[PDB]
Amino acid sequence: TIPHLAIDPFSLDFFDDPYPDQQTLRDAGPVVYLDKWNVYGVARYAEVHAVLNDPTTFCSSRGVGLSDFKKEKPWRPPSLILEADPPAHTRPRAVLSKVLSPATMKTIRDGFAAAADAKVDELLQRGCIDAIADLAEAYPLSVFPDAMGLKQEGREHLLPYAGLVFNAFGPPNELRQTAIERSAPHQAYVNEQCQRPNLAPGGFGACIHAFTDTGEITPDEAPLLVRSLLSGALQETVNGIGAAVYCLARFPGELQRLRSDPTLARNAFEEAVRFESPVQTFFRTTTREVELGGAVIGEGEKVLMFLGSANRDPRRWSDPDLYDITRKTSGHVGFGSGVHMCVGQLVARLEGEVMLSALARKVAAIDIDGPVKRRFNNTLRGLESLPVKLTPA
Numbered sequence: 001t002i003p004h005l006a007i008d009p010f011s012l013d014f015f016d017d018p019y020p021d022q023q024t025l026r027d028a029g030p031v032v033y034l035d036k037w038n039v040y041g042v043a044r045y046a047e048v049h050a051v052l053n054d055p056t057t058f059c060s061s062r063g064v065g066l067s068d069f070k071k072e073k074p075w076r077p078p079s080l081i082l083e084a085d086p087p088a089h090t091r092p093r094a095v096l097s098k099v100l101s102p103a104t105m106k107t108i109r110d111g112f113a114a115a116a117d118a119k120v121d122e123l124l125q126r127g128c129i130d131a132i133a134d135l136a137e138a139y140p141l142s143v144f145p146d147a148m149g150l151k152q153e154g155r156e157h158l159l160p161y162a163g164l165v166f167n168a169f170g171p172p173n174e175l176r177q178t179a180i181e182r183s184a185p186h187q188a189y190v191n192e193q194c195q196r197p198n199l200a201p202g203g204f205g206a207c208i209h210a211f212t213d214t215g216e217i218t219p220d221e222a223p224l225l226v227r228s229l230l231s232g233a234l235q236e237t238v239n240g241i242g243a244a245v246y247c248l249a250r251f252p253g254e255l256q257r258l259r260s261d262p263t264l265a266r267n268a269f270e271e272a273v274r275f276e277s278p279v280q281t282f283f284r285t286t287t288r289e290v291e292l293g294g295a296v297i298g299e300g301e302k303v304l305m306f307l308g309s310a311n312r313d314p315r316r317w318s319d320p321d322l323y324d325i326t327r328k329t330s331g332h333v334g335f336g337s338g339v340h341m342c343v344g345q346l347v348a349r350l351e352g353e354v355m356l357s358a359l360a361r362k363v364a365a366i367d368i369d370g371p372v373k374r375r376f377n378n379t380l381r382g383l384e385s386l387p388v389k390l391t392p393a
């Protein structure tokens, strides 16, 4: 009853052009079986959304990657937030929700904005830049590590540890195997940085440790919660900002509308989050026999959710392959959905908005003038290099 496919969603030429294979996954049926890895797959918006909003049946405690934590040892101590179910997930979530609260964005908005404008002034003096190295990577690095309260020496390990975490969600391919057999410089650094003494006062990390008196988390849980924001924050936001600049480079009509109304900068970033989906996939593990899309899935089965394919479903979106900065982007699963929906979505949208804002007010044209290279990862979609010349406004 369930269609079996030989498509490998974690192969290099799937990453090169995933959109043709993603409709084959959508059009094969509401639920497919991927024989390459012995997992169930869901690529339509309706099934992806349903799985994310049923955490008791499609849990996260047994791993949000391919590995079943009930069968294999995790490559690192499990996350107290991402790889946890309610109720153990509830209050560690409530902490990170308050550390990255609306009231917290009020304190960093000016610095995040001024550092975006300063960066968009710095490359305009250069003209021909790399939008990945000098914009998509440079700006979040110039702002988020300071917002965490991190020291200066050792920050070269943050992006490599970011790519390792998302590569380790994938199957035991060479991308995952090679990422792990590097690690422990990145591991030991990220580990060492989560200790309370190395967290500058006022930063996100020092605020997480202060949230141990509250009885929501204990002092031994605080280092892992700091590790989460050091594992999934930089790269997907870097990939997200690199997505929007790419789209404004591909769709000059949308760049012109953003210039005419810089208020659209926040939704322009959100549509780019849906259009590229930096976090492409995430697994869930069935806690019981479940029926979804006429399919009977047994206990302990891995269910792969195609977040990017669900963001391009024509059953849910109108002309989903075109970037529209005015689209009603509400409902996209780029940030997840349900109890696990991204806890730092406010930090990501803040970074993306003020960066597109500075582009909206100071940039006239964004023209590709060099070979565009792609960065391959088991879970992350993003560009390695985006050679661009920025025309000043």
Ligand code: HEM
Pocket (backbone or CB within 6 Å): 060, 064, 081, 082, 083, 093, 096, 100, 228, 229, 232, 233, 234, 236, 237, 240, 273, 277, 278, 279, 282, 307, 333, 334, 335, 336, 337, 339, 340, 341, 342, 343, 344, 345, 347, 348
């Ligand atoms: C473009 C930017 C971002 C994207 C696309 C993104 C994507 C996602 C997705 C899809 C999830 C759900 C994972 C799941 O359900 O298994 C998630 C959760 C999470 N995100 Fe983000 N994220 C972004 C930015 C950030 C930032 C800036 C932070 C922190 C400063 C952050 C921290 C987290 C954490 C800790 C979780 C786990 C929350 C939970 O499991 O309840 N993310 N993110």
Ligand SMILES: Cc1ccc(C(=O)O)cc1
Pocket (backbone or CB within 6 Å): 079, 080, 081, 082, 083, 165, 227, 228, 229, 231, 232, 279
């Ligand atoms: C996307 C993502 C990656 C890692 C984590 C974590 O808890 O470390 C949370 C979310």
